[PDB]
């Protein structure tokens, strides 16, 4: 099924022709436009008072990355390199080795946040919920170099944001 | 098959004729390029650059390769004439920023592993 958008012929009688002449000479549809703008002037604006008010987000929101720990304080990352393998932008650089206690742990874990596309594939690939994208989205920097994250930087991000990261994960893990 | 079809030229003399026409066009264009793009080079420098670009391909014997080289040269000439290229594009034939690379064995040995 289809429909025509502009297949109406105007009526050609006295009253219709006079209606169109009055519309031509008295600018009635221009007055309708003025009325629409005037009606919008008396509507409450949709503006929010940033930064005192914030745009609404969801637990699934993909922001700044973080490396997480177990309740014991032990790191979750066991350096499987799945996130580095799946990373569409090749933003993840990993080096690992046996730790002094024998654990399988990273010695390098870099994310080039200027290479990153913030797709969240890394946190999908991760089998232990080690790498996540956190809720933070206000981390603009004055230099390019502060956006090339380190393992220390990402672990400090995890320690900084774990309280709300864990709540978001608890909110959404049953969908995953 | 044993033989192949031409691009334009059925022979090497035809390819040379078109090469000469393209060289003529480029040689006449160079002064207008120097003036219009406000290049800081001389017309002698630009025409010597045109000649040196032509001389890179002097070893070509295949008339089809010569024809495609002429096609690409005419394309470049039309980018230059119509001012589709910027000054930076015209000045890229002159690698003014790149440092003089070594050529002899000893300096290449000193600076790294590349042959």
């Amino acid at each position: 099924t289809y429909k025509f958008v502009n297949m109406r012929e105007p009526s050609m009688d006295m009253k219709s022709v006079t209606d169109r002449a009055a519309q031509t000479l008295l600018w009635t549809e221009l007055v309708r436009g003025l009325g629409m703008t005037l009606s919008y002037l008396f509507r409450e604006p949709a503006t929010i008072n940033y930064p005192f008010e914030k745009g609404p987000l969801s637990p699934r929101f993909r922001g700044e990355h973080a490396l997480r720990r177990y309740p014991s304080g032990e790191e979750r990352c066991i350096a499987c390199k799945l996130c580095e393998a799946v990373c569409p932008a090749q933003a993840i650089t990993i080096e690992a080795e046996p730790r002094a206690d024998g654990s399988r742990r990273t010695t390098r874990y870099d994310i080039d946040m200027t290479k990153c596309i913030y797709c969240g594939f890394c946190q999908e690939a991760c089998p232990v919920d080690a790498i996540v994208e956190g809720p933070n989205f206000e981390f603009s920097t004055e230099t390019h170099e502060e956006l090339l994250y380190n393992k220390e930087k990402l672990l400090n991000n995890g320690d900084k944001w774990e309280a709300e990261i864990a709540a978001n994960i608890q909110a959404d893990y049953l969908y995953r | 098959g044993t033989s192949v079809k031409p691009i334009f030229s059925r022979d090497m003399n035809e390819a040379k004729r078109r090469v000469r026409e393209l060289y003529r066009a480029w040689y006449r264009e160079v002064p207008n390029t120097v003036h219009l793009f406000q290049l800081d080079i001389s017309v002698k420098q630009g025409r010597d650059k045109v000649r040196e670009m032509f001389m890179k391909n002097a070893h070509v014997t295949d008339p089809r390769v010569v024809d495609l080289l002429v096609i690409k040269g005419k394309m470049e000439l039309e980018e230059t004439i119509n001012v589709w290229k910027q000054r930076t594009h015209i000045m890229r034939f002159f690698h003014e920023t790149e440092a003089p690379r070594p050529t002899d064995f000893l300096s290449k040995f000193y600076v790294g592993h590349d042959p």
Binding site: - | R17, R20, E21, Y23, R24, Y27, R28, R51, F54
Partner: protein
């Protein structure tokens, strides 16, 4: 008046000795550009331009390649502009 044969020969001579790779002392009436003066066909193409900006008219590729000796340019110019001294 239509410039005579020597009125073409001297112009050819001057524009030929303005060319860098052509030595004035090695340049003669019949100094063939390639074998005598040691030039390329790109050099010949370049000098043919210098025969176009002076004499006004345009020499096309079909016969501009035929202009090897400085006398041959003179004869071509004389023929083209209906010059018969």
């Amino acid at each position: 008046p239509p410039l005579t044969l020597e009125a073409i020969k001297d112009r050819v001579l001057y524009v030929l000795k303005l060319y860098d790779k052509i030595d004035p002392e090695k340049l003669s009436v019949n100094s063939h550009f390639m074998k005598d003066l040691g030039l390329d066909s790109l050099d010949q193409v370049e000098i043919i331009m210098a025969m176009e900006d002076e004499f006004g008219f345009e020499i096309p590729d079909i016969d501009a390649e035929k202009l090897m000796c400085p006398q041959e340019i003179v004869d071509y110019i004389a023929d083209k502009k209906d010059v018969y001294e």
